[PDB]
Design a protein around this ligand. Structure first.
Ligand SMILES: CC(C)CCC[C@@H](C)[C@H]1CC[C@H]2[C@@H]3CC=C4C[C@@H](O)CC[C@]4(C)[C@H]3CC[C@]12C
Ligand SMILES: CC(C)CCC[C@@H](C)[C@H]1CC[C@H]2[C@@H]3CC=C4C[C@@H](O)CC[C@]4(C)[C@H]3CC[C@]12C
Ligand SMILES: CC(C)CCC[C@@H](C)[C@H]1CC[C@H]2[C@@H]3CC=C4C[C@@H](O)CC[C@]4(C)[C@H]3CC[C@]12C
Ligand SMILES: CC(C)CCC[C@@H](C)[C@H]1CC[C@H]2[C@@H]3CC=C4C[C@@H](O)CC[C@]4(C)[C@H]3CC[C@]12C
Ligand SMILES: CCCCCCCC/C=C/CCCCCCCC(=O)OC[C@H](O)CO
Ligand SMILES: CCCCCCCC/C=C\CCCCCCCC(=O)OC[C@H](O)CO
Ligand SMILES: Nc1nc(NCCc2ccc(O)cc2)nc2nc(-c3ccco3)nn12
Ligand SMILES: CCCCCCCC/C=C/CCCCCCCC(=O)O
Ligand SMILES: CCCCCCCC/C=C/CCCCCCCC(=O)O
Ligand SMILES: CCCCCCCC/C=C/CCCCCCCC(=O)O
Ligand SMILES: CCCCCCCC/C=C/CCCCCCCC(=O)O
Ligand SMILES: CCCCCCCC/C=C\CCCCCCCC(=O)O
Ligand SMILES: CCCCCCCC/C=C\CCCCCCCC(=O)O
Ligand SMILES: CCCCCCCC/C=C\CCCCCCCC(=O)O
Ligand SMILES: CCCCCCCC/C=C\CCCCCCCC(=O)O
Ligand SMILES: CCCCCCCC/C=C\CCCCCCCC(=O)O
Ligand SMILES: CCCCCCCC/C=C\CCCCCCCC(=O)O
Ligand SMILES: CCCCCCCC/C=C\CCCCCCCC(=O)O
Ligand SMILES: CCCCCCCC/C=C\CCCCCCCC(=O)O
Ligand SMILES: CCCCCCCC/C=C\CCCCCCCC(=O)O
Ligand SMILES: CCCCCCCC/C=C\CCCCCCCC(=O)O
Ligand SMILES: CCCCCCCC/C=C\CCCCCCCC(=O)O
Ligand code: NA
Length: 390
């Protein structure tokens, strides 16, 4: 039995290293949003709430985790607070991650009502509400779902604890049925699966909208060819009728030129339709050839801009999804071990070294988001560079 202070020293040193890095990187995130107005939008207010949770992992939850690893004598309800506060921060992170996903879904599904629906003022009230809910969920053991009524009195006496005190150890005070059914299944797993469903909807909506843009374009170019090889006024008329509906369909500084572009296009379709309906096939076909000028000078530019805007939303949603996936990857090992402890009382408990490895992996999640923003989001990377240089 090696002196406990040796493995303790390794664990604590690693925790302190993670705390340092979590504070530094997430303070940098908050400083970038505060300073750069191109980063001040509703999405990034949830990003800052998430960075605040991660700063508090470094400032409070890691010092608390170091403390509870010692099994020090404590009043049981004080022990519960330092065991459960990290659950508040994890719960807050979950709400922020779900909000980021929903925000991006609203942006890609209804971009015309996004700015009217999702405002800074409503985001700050959602954030406040979510922090209150996170305290209620993470500190639910303090409302009475705890093991303080059944203290491990032999362990308390062996350590010389005083009356009313327990050896402060996570699995002695926090019930495992709370950890598995309430904290993990209800409060973590279900929101993460909801997030997964929202991201699937985002990527499907993007794929569908890019397919629609390409379809409208091909319909435009195919019907031009229909008109070119029609042999009567009625065929020209039918192809132009369709083109007119599609152009109006697609019509739903750069905005002035693209509105001007579609105005010309509808006007030119209308000129060609009138000629067709007068039975003037050749005149109608020549009028339709003028549509190629508008297609080259305006419609193609609209198509390329619309595509590039959707491709940026896909890239941005992938970045946010990577962050949600990394939260799941860093926290799942600990939840899964708790499931074994709880559901398999005939299995030997996960060994101590694995418990602490899973705890430090969960804490490491508070380090990683600044790196994802730096690597995947030019505007953050550039603001980070400017802050670090100045
Ligand atoms: C806003 C921030 C800076 C304040 C942080 C206050 C923290 C450190 C305080 C608030 C409540 C305190 C706990 C309340 C009661 C107990 C039980 C006692 O037997 C041992 C200490 C212990 C477990 C305290 C540890 C320190 C503690 C967690
Ligand atoms: C989220 C991804 C990375 C999956 C991680 C899976 C990890 C957490 C799984 C894979 C194999 C698992 C171990 C398999 C066997 C045992 C022996 C049993 O007596 C205690 C639980 C314990 C020690 C399990 C702990 C959880 C475990 C380590
Ligand atoms: C989408 C995925 C990641 C959801 C997470 C799946 C979790 C809930 C699954 C993955 C592996 C599962 C464990 C695999 C094996 C055992 C040992 C058995 O004696 C009791 C149940 C128990 C302990 C399972 C509990 C639930 C479990 C931890
Ligand atoms: C990508 C890198 C950082 C992952 C690091 C994984 C390391 C830290 C993990 C993987 C295997 C683990 C070891 C596996 C077995 C034991 C034996 C045990 O009696 C003491 C702890 C010890 C020695 C573990 C310490 C932590 C450990 C070394
Ligand atoms: C964003 C990237 C992730 C951030 C990562 C933050 C820091 C984590 C590194 C820790 C290694 C520290 C050295 C650990 C060496 C210990 C080896 C050892 O001897 O283990 C003893 C054993 O555990 C006794 O039981
Ligand atoms: C023995 C003790 C039992 C205790 C059981 C506790 C139940 C938790 C309930 C409320 C905590 C509220 C905490 C305050 C949350 C602050 C929210 C906030 O500051 O949000 C900022 C906002 O973003 C600005 O725009
Ligand atoms: N099971 C558990 N244990 C601990 N710490 C104690 C590790 C341990 C477990 C058993 C033992 O005999 C001695 C120590 N922290 C823990 N944190 C969590 C957690 C937080 C969020 C999800 O799970 N679970 N968890
Ligand atoms: C896509 C779905 C993702 C996962 C959702 C469902 C998770 C359900 C997990 C259930 C594990 C229940 C384990 C019960 C073990 C009983 C042990 C015993 O009876 O001795
Ligand atoms: C993503 C899901 C992956 C699932 C992996 C396979 C899980 C099925 C394994 C069940 C293992 C059951 C082992 C229980 C052993 C102890 C039984 C006992 O003595 O009570
Ligand atoms: C996706 C992960 C898949 C990993 C491999 C899955 C295989 C898991 C196998 C579990 C076998 C458990 C055997 C337990 C024997 C116990 C003896 C007994 O209880 O009588
Ligand atoms: C992503 C899901 C991965 C979850 C882990 C999958 C591996 C599941 C294997 C479990 C094996 C449990 C072995 C039982 C050990 C004790 C046997 C006994 O005492 O009866
Ligand atoms: C994944 C991030 C890097 C992880 C490196 C892991 C090394 C440190 C973590 C665990 C080592 C095990 C030491 C635990 C000793 C028991 C703790 C205690 O009882 O005080
Ligand atoms: C860029 C570097 C910034 C500062 C990095 C600091 C990294 C080291 C952090 C913590 C190490 C503390 C070591 C204390 C050992 C105590 C173990 C014990 O008390 O038993
Ligand atoms: C000094 C005592 C108070 C400590 C409270 C710490 C809470 C977490 C720290 C910072 C989170 C709030 C930072 C928000 C600043 C940026 C806001 C914005 O980007 O518009
Ligand atoms: C335990 C003592 C400290 C506990 C602090 C917990 C409360 C955290 C409160 C605020 C951090 C959230 C900051 C969110 C800023 C986003 C709002 C916005 O940008 O408009
Ligand atoms: C988790 C809470 C989900 C909040 C849903 C609405 C937030 C989206 C938004 O208004 O930006
Ligand atoms: C806060 C996020 C939203 C919460 C939604 C919760 C919906 C409920 C989902 C999962 C709860 C899991 C219930 C498992 C019950 C088994 C209990 C038992 O048999 O002892
Ligand atoms: C959707 C995420 C998880 C699904 C929500 C519901 C939770 C999983 C479904 C059933 C789990 C029930 C586990 C309890 C079985 C008996 C427990 C026991 O005997 O100890
Ligand atoms: C499109 C590639 C351009 C390369 C530079 C990147 C510019 C910005 C790109 C995407 C913005 C990503 C926004 C994702 C929201 C993150 C929210 C979160 O999950 O925390
Ligand atoms: C419990 C685990 C759930 C974790 C949720 C993590 C967030 C989901 C992340 C990615 C899912 C989306 C995968 C589909 C990719 C399509 C991309 C594309 O069309 O270009
Ligand atoms: C990112 C990597 C994801 C990998 C998920 C799966 C990891 C677990 C895989 C194998 C572990 C299986 C251990 C089975 C132990 C059986 C012990 C026994 O029989 O008692
Ligand atoms: C990466 C290193 C950790 C990954 C898998 C470790 C699984 C070790 C399981 C040994 C526990 C033995 C037992 O409790 O039966
Ligand atoms: Na977090």
């Amino acid at each position: 039995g090696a002196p406990p202070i040796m493995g303790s020293s390794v664990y604590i040193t690693v925790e302190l290293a993670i705390a340092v890095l979590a504070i530094l990187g997430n303070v940098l995130v908050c400083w970038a949003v505060w300073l750069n107005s191109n980063l001040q939008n509703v999405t990034n207010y949830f990003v800052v709430s998430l960075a605040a949770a991660d700063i508090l992992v470094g400032v409070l939850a890691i010092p608390f985790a170091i403390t509870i690893s010692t099994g020090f004598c404590a009043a049981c309800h004080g022990c519960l607070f330092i065991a459960c506060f990290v659950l508040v921060l994890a719960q807050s992170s979950i709400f922020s991650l779900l909000a980021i996903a929903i925000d991006r879904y609203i942006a890609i599904a209804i971009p015309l009502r996004y700015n009217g629906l999702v405002t800074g003022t409503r985001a700050a009230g959602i954030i406040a509400i979510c922090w209150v809910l996170s305290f209620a969920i993470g500190l639910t053991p303090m409302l009475g779902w705890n093991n303080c009524g059944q203290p491990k009195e032999g362990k308390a006496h062996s350590q010389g604890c005083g009356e009313g005190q327990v050896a402060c150890l996570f699995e002695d005070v926090v019930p495992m049925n709370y950890m598995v059914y309430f904290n993990f299944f209800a409060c973590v797993l279900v929101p993460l699966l909801l997030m997964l469903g929202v991201y699937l909807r985002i990527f499907a909506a993007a794929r569908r909208q890019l397919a629609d843009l390409e379809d409208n374009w091909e319909t435009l170019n195919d019907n031009l060819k229909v008109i070119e090889k029609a042999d009567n006024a009625a065929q020209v008329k039918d192809a132009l009728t369709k083109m007119r509906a599609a152009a109006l369909d697609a019509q739903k500084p750069e905005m002035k030129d693209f509105r001007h572009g579609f105005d010309i296009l509808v006007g030119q379709i209308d000129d060609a339709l009138k000629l067709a309906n007068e039975g003037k096939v050749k005149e109608a076909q020549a009028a339709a050839e003028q549509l190629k000028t508008t297609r080259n000078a305006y419609i193609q530019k609209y198509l390329e801009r619309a595509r590039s805007t959707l491709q940026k939303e896909v890239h941005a949603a992938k970045s946010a999804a990577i962050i949600a996936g990394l939260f799941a990857l860093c926290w799942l090992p600990l939840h899964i071990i708790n499931c074994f402890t709880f559901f398999c009382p005939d299995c030997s408990h996960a060994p101590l070294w694995l418990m602490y490895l899973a705890i430090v992996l969960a804490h490491t999640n508070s380090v990683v988001n600044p790196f994802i923003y730096a690597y995947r989001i030019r505007e953050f990377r550039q603001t980070f560079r400017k802050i670090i240089r100045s």
